[model samples]
Target: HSHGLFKKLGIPGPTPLPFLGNILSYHKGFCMFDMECHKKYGKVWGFYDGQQPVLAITDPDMIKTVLVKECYSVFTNRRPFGPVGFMKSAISIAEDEEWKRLRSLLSPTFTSGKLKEMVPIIAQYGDVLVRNLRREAETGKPVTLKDVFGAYSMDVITSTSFGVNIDSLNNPQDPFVENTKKLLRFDFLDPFFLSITVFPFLIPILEVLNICVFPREVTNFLRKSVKRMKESRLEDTHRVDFLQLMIDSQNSSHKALSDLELVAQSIIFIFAGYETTSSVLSFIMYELATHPDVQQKLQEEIDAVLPNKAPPTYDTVLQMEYLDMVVNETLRLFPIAMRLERVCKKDVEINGMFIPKGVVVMIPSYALHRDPKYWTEPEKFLPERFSKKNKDNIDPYIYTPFGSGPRNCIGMRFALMNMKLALIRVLQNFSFKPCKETQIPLKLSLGGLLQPEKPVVLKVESRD
Candidate 1:
């Protein structure tokens, strides 16, 4: 469908352009666009993305239909930039069969029984973070919140993903951490990544010409990590982490996979697992500090849950109700992945709008979560909204911090458990007060995962 093409088909629409569609101003913030559309075109509206008409279904039931029932065929995995390899693409990149196989192999790793094995490792990293932050608190020096959080997250991912300890928490500038940061920072090179992924057909031709798609150095580093992990032996279930899962994932028929495949998968997990969790925690901290009452209440919850402990353990962390609420509330506003896009595989009628094939369907997650109609006082920091008494009042699809459907985040449980454990340890050991350097209202980073554009400063004092 081209511009104004959907109108001829009796679909209500917002204004759009041919080449740009709504993409010109979209990257500024997709949430703002969704909000404006909801205001003008109502909950269910039609829009275009570069001559491709798409029906924006913000209704929870419609969202549920798209996610659960029609997931496999109707909504194909989205890959905007094809310049990147399909395998190196997002987790949702695989199609029908390949997708199912990969999911089958990986799903068991995230089960509660499997994740329980990693709890001790999570608690270990949590303690390390507490110790570092306590040291910072003692000196009264300006702490780099983002940097420290990044280190902590990287260490957790390293241990969990590869079964190799980088000890990044002790040293902020580890090479693996640096490389991971560089790969994530490639949002600035979206055009390059896009060209490689979208134009994958040309990749073989490009390869014949001796040209590489993504940076060769990145691919090499990833391949090396897996080779290193398998050759080494770790003591006792190897912490029953991701590496252990990969080791368990062995298939004799599939030649047991090369070290490269292992590394590639683990690397993806590291990127997807660590960065988002760290960023969201930072956002939660910022939100809590900005909302003093919320912070105090959360602190009170921590005190009640672990009264005598200076550092909260895995078992104690999950008991803090208010802290859980704060984390959820923050996720509502600052989702790690702000949009969920799927390629329209076949012609489908959604909300009476006929969406043609090849059109990209974008679900603006952050916008949907904050829609005023669904949430009262949406912008305000109110964790009480998620409480048992109040939770039933709102629709489930509206608050998808971890997304929904078959392609939802696989390691969400693992990430949340680690994050919760870390937050508890920090909260129990010290109290935080936002400093002048802390970014008020928290400007988001232009290209990185949902994170503050600047480092947040906080005055930390040991909990009395």
Candidate 2:
């Protein structure tokens, strides 16, 4: 009996059954499907996606080929939003030409030059966070940094993306935050969303119930916000930060984007930008608190950067090498955007296997980041591993905290600057030690991007 790429080479794949389609063994626990398949059948193997074959390629060279060179030939159509609960209108879902056009147009807004303009806006929010933490520490009560950091993140995104201040800093449980949480509930893992993507015909039925998968409210809000921005010449003064960047670029390109396209891209930028940044920063602080030495060392570096004890200026944050190493190490262990999804653009031969077009190519960033094959001591949280001297030993393909290739994270610079800036301000004013409620070996939320299972409680003590 012959199979897929494996059968051609006399190599066997994980036993594939019918409708269940190897998924039974894949979902045994918290382990990702890709890893489970890799564990059983090595790097290159093919499995049945219901009836069709979906090959899993884990080899770095193969992954590079698929993601970098032949990305267009593979998963050309963005996977249907079967799990998101709403149809994906966000730019992340755009494929092929639309994907390329929008990504290029929006890329400049998040570049190093543009991110420099956003430093002051980010720093302002950082102060709000520090002030809140300062107040919390005074009472000698534990504080959940997630909610605080979440509020600050939301504020920054709203200010930059929507061109309005939602005042999330003053109000921890802001309506905007609640609305954003509703968006994360659109999970690809859900049975409803899964069925829709697997069977596109079900979309009409799903749409009837307003269950297109991704959060509809978020979709609506973004549309409305973009429409409002377009009506006014807000870029003159009130455009604030990134929204202005988008507005400025919207007309610069000869092929101007549609209203919905602009909204979709902006929403992806705002929500994804803030959510991932805050989640990882909060986690890093939790990890640092757990490892007191790292926290003290980071504090020392922060002090050294700004010896006069002033708040972090743009130049100061960049000079904090130890802090950067800590962030790099934290991202190595628990990256915010843990995995990436790429569609096979073309049929390619690699590692003695032929992965066909239109198959989903997943770069399991979290697995690769922690893969023992890649790093010597993958599990341990040692910042020294990412230091200047040792950093050169790492494989660039394997160390993609900010993604890789042309379609990589445009806002990587902005996001990292904001996260580190916030950390600097918070650490300068107060100290964080884990509280009783902090989850040890934290678990991530199901469906959306990974996050700490519970709010990380930290004792924020004042420095002065």
Candidate 3:
């Protein structure tokens, strides 16, 4: 059914294997797969995921010109447009006029003022995280930092986003936590998932069949849980969480998100907030553990900022320039999303390259961040690279810890705030070190998000 489409377009890329496209090479993991592809091919190369034609644009200016500059009018939608899993009303997936509407509605939820209101809420969870880790730290035992952060991340998301209180740090057995882990667990090799990638058109059929990537029960559980939370919030005269804020935007006659969309937003935020923050938080610890000098430097900054290990306010977290560097460096090294995608709406020529409508443009964030041309000693953990003195030298297109353009991660600031809150608390109480089981260079597994091949376990010790 297919001929030499890429050959006709004059875009160079790795050869494909029938409907499988270059998916098998992806087993090496997405970052390396993309990194290697960009290395072998030129700046702009054509690649396939199943039968889908993807233009991997690693060139910074091309990215800024095409993806950023004309993003709204040109590549407006991320996907084909519609409900993706439970992300129906999630602004991350919303598009065009709809995108602007949802963006406007959701933007205030993460504003500096709103984030400040959640700091005490987030710090409470940070306190719990530190308190829970004290036992392991006292015994000089290694604890799984990812799992700990996952629990804490969930705790903060549930409280701040939905006003649900599931203290998973002390109670990993919580139903919500268990369901989320099961929900997040998916294999790329699964035929169902591979088929959808192979035949992109199968999505509408799958959605019609009520089939989903997430387990049905888990989906129902989240839907029900969010419904229950929203229901109770409906009774309150006043409330101040992410959900409550969204609820306030709602109308009986329906102008903003309805009850269904509200639930979807809640579920999406929980899924989005939990995984991304936890992954970065654990990776940050991994870097600090391996790089004690960096850890001590951050610790010194925390000491100076807080004076006596006092709980950090929102402003205090922002004041630590070195802490910001360490966090940025961690994000650069281990970005959560390996690549960012945008679909072409209308055919156009840009910088002499003709892009036809419907082709997906991918910004290889991991590869771009580690691109040797832009970053010196790309693999090295160097916070100084993001220092105030040097950060301006960084090209935004090359160093998008969050995806670049108007379509970047909405939870960018929210995630950073939560990560900083937890890190400040944890570093104040203790220090992390690599144990015998620690991987010197973390072996990340290939998937949608950057995940460790094994548990990110590190030794916890009292800084005193």
Candidate 4:
């Protein structure tokens, strides 16, 4: 029954098997599997997850057509990951008008003005991070930087999202930090999660049965944290943070954020805000450690702009062109969200190919970012590839780390600001170097998100 899918549709892919389809075949990894599929059958190919047909799109032009808000009205919704326990209403998994409304309400919280208000928040936690690293440096021991950054990011998100500061770095076993660690550690493609995603029919039944993708412990911690925050807030009290803005919106808006919605948004903020940024920060440090010349050049740029170790103002970091290039190059290579998914709500035609309604569209971003057609020396870590002269030659849709169009990551500015601030602060004080334990070429785990197979160990040396 699975044999004739591509043949009948005139698309190309390996003939799939009954029941499992290509699920069992993707043992190597999703990104690697898709990369090989594209190599074997060209950019547009048919893939199957059980009986559902997934249109694998690797071509930049095709991706542009599917992702751009104006061009792809029919492809608005992302593939559902069922209900993520308590975060069922999250903007990441929301659809259509619901997505639009949530985006509108949350958008103001991540605006330039709002993010600027949060800079001091990041710096406050960043101070803790530097001190922690200094302690580690003094010991002359290689440390897994991802854990360090993860804890730092967790502190930043908690402070900004809930208007409370919990020092995860100092109190590593704090319930919120521990639970967040567990939440990030869960594999999204585990059999249970995969079954619900591939077989949509199971979603309603599973949800009715109160089954959730996240473990109960993870959800409980998030729910309790938000509940505690609300309980702690006084009616007349206000703060310049996401929770305050959301509470105000709930108070003022016609379609108010319910109690559950408030909890859901706070949880989404932590997962969305920190997980990706921490991963990117980890890779950036790795690249800097591996490429001394690149690190030195970046430091030279930072030193010139921030003479006398001036604090990284929002505008100051924004003007650091070299820093921007380094970040972009890192993102291009190791986008934490390595793939993007969109589902067709109506039949659409693109590049003369007919895409029927309900067919899932897969944008293999890892493959797209490394496509030889768009990137030169695709495997190398060269930030100059994104220089002013070279950057203009590249196409628009080819380098979307945060994604594209109106529905793209709403917290992009916040994430970038947080990352740049951390990088500037760290690089200003220290230089990263490979240690005996450092993973020379990172052994990446092809999990739901791209990450190191294990913790990355590197030495941080004080520049002073």
Per-residue lDDT tens digits for candidate 1, residues 1-464, read 36776567665666775455655545544566666777787666677655556666676776776766678868746644433452442344556656666676677788988777688877887878888888888997767777677778888877776555665756657677666654442352255543443344665676556554445576677667666666555423244778767776674311343455566667677657666776777777777767878877777787777776655555665667777777778888887787676777888876555667776666767878888778888878889987868878867677777878898889888877888887777776777777878766777764424556677777777866
Alpha-carbon runs more than 4 Å astray in model 1? 12-14, 51-54, 86-90, 185-214, 232-237, 251-259, 310-315, 350-353, 445-449
lDDT of 4 by residue, 178-200 (tens): 88766563455677767764676
Candidate 2, residue 393: Cα displacement in angstroms equals 0.8
Candidate 4, number of clashes: 0
Tens-digit lDDT string for candidate 3 (77-130): 876532266555567666687777777667778788888888888898888899
TM-score to true structure, per model: 0.88, 0.89, 0.94, 0.95
Q: Candidate 4, clashing residue pairs?
A: none
Error of 1 at 63 (Å): 0.6
Residue 76 in candidate 4, Cα distance off native in Å: 1.1
For model 2, state the Cα shift of residue 305 in Å.
0.9
Writing each residue's lDDT as its tens digit, candidate 2 over 1-464 gives 12354466455467766454554543432235555656676656566544445565567777676667655555444444553332254557766877777777776776776677777777877887877777778877888776788777777877776546665756646656566655432444456544543465666776667774546776786566567776665645444466666666666743576666676666677656766776788888988989999999998888887775576777777888998898999998876666666656667666566656656565667777877777778778899988889888887677777877766777778778888888888888888887777777776665434666576788877777
Query: Going through the candidates in order, what is the number of backbone clashes in each?
Result: 10, 19, 0, 0
What C-alpha lDDT, on a 0 to 100 scale, does residue 319 get in candidate 4? 88
TM-score of 3: 0.94
* Every candidate's CA RMSD: 3.3, 3.1, 2.3, 2.0
